[PDB]
Amino acid sequence: STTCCYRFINKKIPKQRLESYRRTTSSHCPREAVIFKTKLDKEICADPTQKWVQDFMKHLDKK
């Protein structure tokens, strides 16, 4: 609980390696980030400000 990401990174990521996507809860969190779940069952947080991550969200099925 109280998930947060203080060190969000805007680097590019592979598209196929992911498995699911999630939003954040900025209750106690500093500057906002996003949560994505990889196919390797490893969670990750990244900077949503970049254009590459925006294209990643656009390409996400999300349905």
Binding site: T2, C4, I9, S27, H28, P30
Partner: protein
């Protein structure tokens, strides 16, 4: 490159149900015991100086002990916002009322030395309980149940209310005791354990206000982990208050005799 999201320690949640239920039951038992050991004057408890203030501290502890489990986690859903608001309101009202009784006694022991003055004692107790019930307005307005569990509300339309609540908590819990301990071993009466118990809940609330209002910003995941660990430790040190206060009251009563 890990870049993994940070996760909280999250101690107090459901797995710690005993620390709520058993604590509340022991608190109500002890508080009722020390209450009807005064309501029954056959045990030579009538010779104490200023006993009604002592009994009011005890009944405040009893109310707090009764109220503990309603806002406690571990229980499932169906907890309406009404019950959660009730819990916060009476819990913080009891805390404020006891702190105000302590502040009144430590400063007007001289007035109490004249015996049991009827008008003075009655006016003091009624005004103190009225202002305690008044001071719990911001917390009871800024209360809710997020999915059925008691959390405080920090939102744009509640910023002023929560700021007033947190400044009142700061005052009553850390500025009031240290204010009484100003005049820049200890000399004042032994019952400072009340404010020692509520001191972490006073200091941490200001930091929670600063962080939750986006004024400050955290550094790393270690800072966040320390923050919520301190928050949970302060909550535990304020919830053990049920069992703390009546025993200190009894020791004070049976040591000054």
């Amino acid at each position: 490159e890990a870049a993994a999201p940070c996760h909280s320690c999250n101690l107090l949640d459901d797995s710690a149900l005993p620390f709520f239920i058993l604590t509340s039951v022991l608190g109500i038992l002890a508080s009722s015991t020390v209450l009807f050991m005064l309501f029954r004057p056959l045990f030579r408890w009538q010779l104490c100086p200023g006993w009604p203030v002592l009994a009011q501290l005890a009944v405040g502890s009893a109310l707090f002990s009764i109220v503990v489990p309603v806002l406690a986690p571990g229980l499932g859903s169906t907890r309406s916002s009404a019950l959660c608001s009730l819990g916060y309101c009476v819990w913080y009202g009891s805390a404020f009322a006891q702190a105000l009784l302590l502040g009144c006694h430590a400063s007007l022991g001289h007035r109490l030395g004249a015996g049991q003055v009827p008008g003075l004692t009655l006016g003091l107790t009624v005004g103190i309980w009225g202002v305690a019930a008044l001071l719990t307005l911001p917390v009871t307005l800024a209360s809710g149940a997020s999915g059925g569990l008691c959390t405080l509300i920090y939102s744009t339309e509640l910023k002023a209310l929560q700021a007033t609540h947190t400044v009142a908590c700061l005052a009553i819990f850390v500025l009031l005791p240290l204010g009484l301990f100003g005049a820049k071993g200890p000399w004042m009466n032994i019952l400072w354990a009340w404010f020692i118990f509520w001191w972490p809940h006073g200091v941490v609330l200001g930091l929670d206000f600063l962080v939750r209002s986006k004024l400050l910003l955290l550094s790393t995941c270690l800072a966040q982990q320390a923050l919520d660990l301190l928050l949970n430790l302060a909550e535990a040190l304020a919830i053990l208050h049920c069992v703390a206060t009546p025993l200190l009251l009894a020791l004070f009563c049976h040591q000054a005799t």
